Design a protein around this ligand. Sequence first.
Ligand SMILES: CCCCCCCC(=O)O
Ligand SMILES: CCCCCCCC(=O)O
Ligand SMILES: CCCCCCCC(=O)O
Ligand SMILES: CCCCCCCC(=O)O
Ligand SMILES: [K+]
Ligand SMILES: [K+]
Ligand SMILES: [K+]
Ligand SMILES: [K+]
Ligand SMILES: [K+]
Ligand SMILES: [K+]
Ligand SMILES: [K+]
Ligand SMILES: [K+]
Ligand SMILES: [K+]
Ligand SMILES: [K+]
Ligand SMILES: [Zn+2]
Ligand SMILES: [Zn+2]
Ligand SMILES: [Zn+2]
Ligand SMILES: [Zn+2]
Lengths: 369, 366, 366, 368
Amino acid sequence: MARTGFYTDERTFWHATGMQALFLPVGDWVQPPNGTAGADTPDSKRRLLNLAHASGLIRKLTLPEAIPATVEDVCRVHPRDYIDRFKATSDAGGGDLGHLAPFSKGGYEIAMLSCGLAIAAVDDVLSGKVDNAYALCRPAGHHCLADTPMGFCLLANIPIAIEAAKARHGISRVAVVDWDVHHGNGTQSIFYDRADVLTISIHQDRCFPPGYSGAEDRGEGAGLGYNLNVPLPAGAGHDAYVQAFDDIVVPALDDFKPDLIIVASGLDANSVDPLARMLLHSESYRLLTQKMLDAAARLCGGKLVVVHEGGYAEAYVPFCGHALLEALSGERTAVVDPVLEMAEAWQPGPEAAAFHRQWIDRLVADLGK
Amino acid sequence: RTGFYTDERTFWHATGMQALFLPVGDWVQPPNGTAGADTPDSKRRLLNLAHASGLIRKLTLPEAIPATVEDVCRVHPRDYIDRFKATSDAGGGDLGHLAPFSKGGYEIAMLSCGLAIAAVDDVLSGKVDNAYALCRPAGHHCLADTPMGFCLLANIPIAIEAAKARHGISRVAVVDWDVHHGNGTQSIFYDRADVLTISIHQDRCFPPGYSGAEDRGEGAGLGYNLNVPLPAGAGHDAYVQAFDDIVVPALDDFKPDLIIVASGLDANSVDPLARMLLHSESYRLLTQKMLDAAARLCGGKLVVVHEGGYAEAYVPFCGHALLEALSGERTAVVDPVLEMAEAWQPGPEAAAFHRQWIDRLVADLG
Amino acid sequence: RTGFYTDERTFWHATGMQALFLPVGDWVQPPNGTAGADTPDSKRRLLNLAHASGLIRKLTLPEAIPATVEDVCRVHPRDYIDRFKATSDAGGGDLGHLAPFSKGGYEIAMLSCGLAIAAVDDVLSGKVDNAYALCRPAGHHCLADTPMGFCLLANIPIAIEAAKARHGISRVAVVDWDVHHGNGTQSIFYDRADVLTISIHQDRCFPPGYSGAEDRGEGAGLGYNLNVPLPAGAGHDAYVQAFDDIVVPALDDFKPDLIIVASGLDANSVDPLARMLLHSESYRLLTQKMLDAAARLCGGKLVVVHEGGYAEAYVPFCGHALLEALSGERTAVVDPVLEMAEAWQPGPEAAAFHRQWIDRLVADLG
Amino acid sequence: MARTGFYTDERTFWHATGMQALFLPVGDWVQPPNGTAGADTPDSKRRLLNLAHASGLIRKLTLPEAIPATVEDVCRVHPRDYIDRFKATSDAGGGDLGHLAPFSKGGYEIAMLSCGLAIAAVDDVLSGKVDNAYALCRPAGHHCLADTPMGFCLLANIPIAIEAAKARHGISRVAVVDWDVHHGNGTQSIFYDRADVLTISIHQDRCFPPGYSGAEDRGEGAGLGYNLNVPLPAGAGHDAYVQAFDDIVVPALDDFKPDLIIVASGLDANSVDPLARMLLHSESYRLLTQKMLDAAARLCGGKLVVVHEGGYAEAYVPFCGHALLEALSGERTAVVDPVLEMAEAWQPGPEAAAFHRQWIDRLVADLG
Ligand SMILES: CCCCCCCC(=O)O
Ligand SMILES: CCCCCCCC(=O)O
Ligand SMILES: CCCCCCCC(=O)O
Ligand SMILES: CCCCCCCC(=O)O
Ligand SMILES: [K+]
Ligand SMILES: [K+]
Ligand SMILES: [K+]
Ligand SMILES: [K+]
Ligand SMILES: [K+]
Ligand SMILES: [K+]
Ligand SMILES: [K+]
Ligand SMILES: [K+]
Ligand SMILES: [K+]
Ligand SMILES: [K+]
Ligand SMILES: [Zn+2]
Ligand SMILES: [Zn+2]
Ligand SMILES: [Zn+2]
Ligand SMILES: [Zn+2]
């Protein structure tokens, strides 16, 4: 089988965004929460790992102990001035150096560690240590610009791991498939004029960054044709996503011939996420991972790396990620999703489904069909 | 004069140890934070903001008086009420489909129901011009013999049958803009022409898989039930068009003597239990559409009854703009989500699909 | 008539992301539940229980009047107040020792203080016979220029100084039965004989390591400060003897024109921030001692001001019985812990020890 | 000090007592909690393991996979009828079959799992796979009677582990030192007429079971002299516990000559626990662990097993248990207890200290 590496560190759950009601700073008209503070909560990620323990799936993976990102690693993407300001704010108690990117004292070390998980997953897959990998990163990365953190991302996890890999393995072509429900503006920005990294984002139309769709932003200069935005209307679900993957994502991968596929895996397109309006369920994520596994076996020797990003529904994220992990490792457990049959009843009916198919066919046509 | 019907103990109702709406055990790990989905704070926080803004001081807050056994038995069989009380006395349970409650939840449900009775009664007797009943537990999914979907008693139907007994009211219209289908209201009045039941809801959401546009009543009630399913991901302009093209015309045709809104706030843009895109100004505007209809059709007699709403951070701003509109007051509250939620709204291609969807609903109505 | 002074926004003060009182970072993992130790609910649940019992119906609730900067500057230097406001605008912080606050904590601290000002004002003016101010943030650890121990303004000192300016009251006694030493009150009036400051507190608890029996005032204030430290693990009978043999005799000798009690409820038997064994009826009986003293010494003028109290589940029953005595009102509330808390009380050998300890304090007072 | 087994399972953190405010059942006058429900909360135990991970301590220990207790196991202590009703209620959604022992659907499986942690820890120490062991038990066990669960204890973890050891190794003499702040009434009861298990309990006088002190309850029959209660007054702290251990607990162990020492380790005597009134701090638990390590080394070839019981301060329990684990494993980390200085300042002064010493002097005198 594909021995799957699972990259996690306890301290990633000790990152805390501060006293917010969901994503809202307390202060003014926003009453502080009486329960868990924040939206990126520790349990919105730890509960996935908890469920993988309870099912026994965790014992079927290998869990290496990753070293943190070094300053040299992260400075292949970020300017040292950002990194120095980040560390100094963190040493002094935390803050927010960007757009909705709050952190607490010592958040700098936890982000370097989070980043180390994605570096390690990429490094170990390229070295053959494992056949494929899942990095349970927290804080996430796919919104972080070179000099600006945003949307709960403090470092550019996947870009940093890619740049390390080019330095240590000389890898020529990398494709990033971002199915976190929000646009991967960070990844898009960092490689926008580069043709060696193909950046694909599937995301809810206009959600985050608010108002942005991006299907005509396809790259610049040498990177023209190497960025691919797939916005999908709010309220799209399982059949829409798999059509998008069959008709856009997978052919673009086939065209590009990567030497490595990386999934920026947010789980926030799930049917009860507060931070988006999509209708994916656990089996959606199993099937999308299988398409990525098949593509990687066909294109780059099974070299597939999944890097956790967003996902905010503490009760349902575990089941979506666990089905993903089952696919990735080719293992099956006794876990049954208690929401699955309701999520299937919830899916768009025939009138909405023809609209999603019309919407995706136009994206295809607009790309040169 | 706006009356505001609330009682501290509606916040003491507790659905038990669920992760969101998932009963714990087997593969569901217990929540480390607040248990459940219908949490006390997902309703209390609206009242807290009405206090913090000074709005609540411009409203009249009468003391709650629970529904009686006689009140609730106008709708429910005595056997259900009896099993409910006995299960509650022995520590709680669930007598339906996703309707859990704890010890003493029976009395809290009778108290919650009483808020709706009194809101309707006081408006009909002109003690106040309109009214808002902060019900918890909610009511619009509860069937005559079966509680459902966090609804233990049929709050609005009980209030209506009380109104018929106490005031002899002839025509009532219920407009249910909670994001789930008002199956409880629909069923209880399905064969009656004196109560027009309107439900605007996310297509196929709860009850799961139900759309319902063809279900327009039976017998004497044929033509007096009106389901308006909207697709997941619909937002402000879709709801406005549905009210302009379906809901408000249906009211003008029916000529009610009282309008009740079953007001869930769970169509809000960050709610976990639906996929819709309404924001606080949506609720302000739909409330003004009901105020206008009430002034036009029944001397301004409007009652708003709280049902769902599960985003504890954003529900308060939606319901507070509703309350401003209802009271005709205007506070300093600024919705910190409004700009982003407006940015989130469906773009042209999605907006065209919503408009085509609603146009077809209108057409199907003959 | 008992006036009850409270405002929704006092429950919006947040101390930030701490596990209990431990700032997050380094080896302290963020809490998954409610953050902090001075949590909103550790105070709001007292108000909730008084609504649920009907007791709140029997009291008068004046609208809150925030403290003015002129009020607070009768105790604090203006520079402190300006730095406090600027730090709160910039998003909060901590300007003292264990006194964190979030953005907007300045306004809420000013509100909280206005509750104690008003409660004292309305009793002196005869609008109510006695009063309870549900202050949050608390006040009695705050120094003139240094906030401490969750206390951002010196609520009771400010209230006293407003009272001297508006009414010219001559003699005020403050009885501090919060379980921590009232070091703020002690320091502010230490060289003054017009305010007698008494503090009963767990030996060495907060400020840590302080006992203080020999600290009796200075200059004209000599003999007008009275510390009563009590060993960890003392309970109902120990406190009763301390009040009978020390506190009440000191009130008799002093002849106050007003009694104010700084009532933290953190000496209760399950509080995390102290080791004492008081129960709900302990607070009812200690309030009756203060009521009888006030009746006998100053025409029944008694103000109770909320300080600390951190056991969310049990603080409501302690404060509710206090309010019952304060108002002379009966409810059906029953403390479901009382029998157990009575069984937990120190046995005979410990009780002889507590009696010997208190006898020594009596003797040392000369 | 040694190669230390650490016995934990993720599902022990999935046991939920239900919708209580602290230990008070919601309903009537008790308002539901908005934060974490209950007193025995998952995090009041998990946070110890989380810190042992974050410190790197976990990487120096051995973590065997969990082996649940079998029904045969638990029925060496409990009548099968109790176990079957427990199973039937757990399947039907949970309940409470005793006194303050509530549980949710599937709580039976998790109690069987938790018990297995103690069984395996004892087994592995006796068979020599590890020199000492820590069992992160949840639910706890030391209040559970043979037919009556109580005080958040659904199975008699430590008794069941001792009877398994007897059945599998023939062990003659076991001492249990219960320093959980509450009386170990379950262990006392099960072994009350037996001379082969010396049961020692140090606890807050009159705390739980409420009103109970127990110094004069020394066993019966063949068990006379083989149960030892050390009630301590509420408000006792570090120096009182030290004296109790030097003057009573360690002398008892030396007379009894155990072949195995089991510590029932609740951490609820820490200085901020809601469910007791004691003033222990992290270094108290380190030193008490050293005392038991030295007794195990002198009396039974270092065979020492520490079984988690109570502990309810989710912010401070981790530092107390982490210093415990440092002593058990003999591994140092960079963990610094942020509360320690203050808790030292909190400790009883000279007048209360003299009361605690004469109290303990009185207990020693009554022994004989
Ligand atoms: C403004 C709220 C939108 C979510 C921001 C973080 C998105 C992500 O998880 O990638
Ligand atoms: C999604 C499963 C539960 C839905 C309950 C709907 C209750 C409401 O109308 O607020
Ligand atoms: C860090 C020690 C906690 C004690 C501070 C609380 C003060 C009070 O409630 O009066
Ligand atoms: C009711 C207060 C005490 C609860 C009993 C649990 C004691 C323990 O942790 O052993
Ligand atoms: K690119
Ligand atoms: K994306
Ligand atoms: K209804
Ligand atoms: K509806
Ligand atoms: K009808
Ligand atoms: K003071
Ligand atoms: K005091
Ligand atoms: K003085
Ligand atoms: K004990
Ligand atoms: K024995
Ligand atoms: Zn996302
Ligand atoms: Zn709803
Ligand atoms: Zn205090
Ligand atoms: Zn205990």
